Write a protein that binds this ligand. Sequence first.
Ligand SMILES: Oc1ccc(/C=C/c2cc(O)cc(O)c2)cc1
Ligand SMILES: Oc1ccc(/C=C/c2cc(O)cc(O)c2)cc1
Ligand SMILES: [Mg+2]
Ligand SMILES: [Mg+2]
Lengths: 208, 206
Amino acid sequence: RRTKEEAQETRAQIIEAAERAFYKRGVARTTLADIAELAGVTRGAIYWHFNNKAELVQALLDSLHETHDHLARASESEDEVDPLGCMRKLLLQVFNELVLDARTRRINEILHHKCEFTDDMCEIRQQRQSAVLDCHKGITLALANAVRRGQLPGELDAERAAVAMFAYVDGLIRRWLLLPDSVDLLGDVEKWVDTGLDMLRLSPALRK
Amino acid sequence: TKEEAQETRAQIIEAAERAFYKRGVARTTLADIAELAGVTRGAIYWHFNNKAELVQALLDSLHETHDHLARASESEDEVDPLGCMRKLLLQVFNELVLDARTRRINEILHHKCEFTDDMCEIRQQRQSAVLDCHKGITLALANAVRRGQLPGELDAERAAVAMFAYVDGLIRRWLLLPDSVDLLGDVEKWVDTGLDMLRLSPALRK
Ligand SMILES: Oc1ccc(/C=C/c2cc(O)cc(O)c2)cc1
Ligand SMILES: Oc1ccc(/C=C/c2cc(O)cc(O)c2)cc1
Ligand SMILES: [Mg+2]
Ligand SMILES: [Mg+2]
């Protein structure tokens, strides 16, 4: 109809086909030409939207923020009266979306288990570094806010606590992707979130 | 001869580490590895049925250093099982940071090895290996519980999952962003942060 609307539809068809192809065959051996054929678009069209497969990987990775942005910004705001509470809701939502949404599950499985870091495509590792560094910044801000509001210990090492928490969450996600039946991540989602928050609130090793 | 076969196998393993680390698992073939190792006339296929088996050899190689401390933590006659586990985890992080071989293998497993349907054995062998680690961790913690070193109502299974998640995530964080974690200089605090989760979180109780 209109150029932009047609372009948005094409882009979304490609991204969806990229998910399916990376998920079955992996990033290393999938080409844009392969994804174009699975999306039912021309090679000219796919290369118009994405210059290389690293950009297509980044589009998938960037798409994981959208759902959580509301709660993340709230937990990071200094004006929030209950920053720790926003973090808990954020973490529940992170796990809930991972188990229930096929798309989110698929993308995380791509990023964890179907995407390699090779100097052949150095930007895949550089983008991952940027993404994690950025999430670390946000976590540190929300923990520092929680400390200032009396919700976490006064001498918490916010930086180290932020690493601890991300490690725990990232490991649990990867474990659930590898062995879903090993973890009732949905039925016990509150215990899994609270286990991680307990570490930050109670461990003396995380204090200055 | 035994010696020359064992030496050829080792040369292949070290070559596989170099090739996988540079180009990744997905696109590296056994023939490429043999070319890098300088092994000829089909030698690699006598030592490894396929590429998955060679990946499993690298992962299996990580257990050797820690087997003593791991088995001790699992022994029902061990009087200090949690101390053996703390010694274990300190060694895991020290080796990661100090040993080029261990770091490089972990970077391969975490960041340079796809799981594909074409080669389903990689994912299945990783499942079995994590399940075996989890079985051992659970026995260590149950031992620690039995010996009054962790809370009597600890859910040993969920605790074992939590400890593994934290450790696995921290390694992977250190591999991606080394300068964000003083893993060696602060090793004791990183190990105790995780142990504190098990010792202290009410959410891991039954
Ligand atoms: O405070 C926190 C807020 C968010 C998170 C999310 C971590 C995460 C790690 C992954 O490997 C995949 C993913 O989709 C998310 C962790 C801590
Ligand atoms: O109690 C525990 C004993 C051992 C471990 C090992 C974890 C681990 C995770 C990795 O991704 C790589 C690795 O080389 C080791 C975790 C907990
Ligand atoms: Mg989302
Ligand atoms: Mg070793």
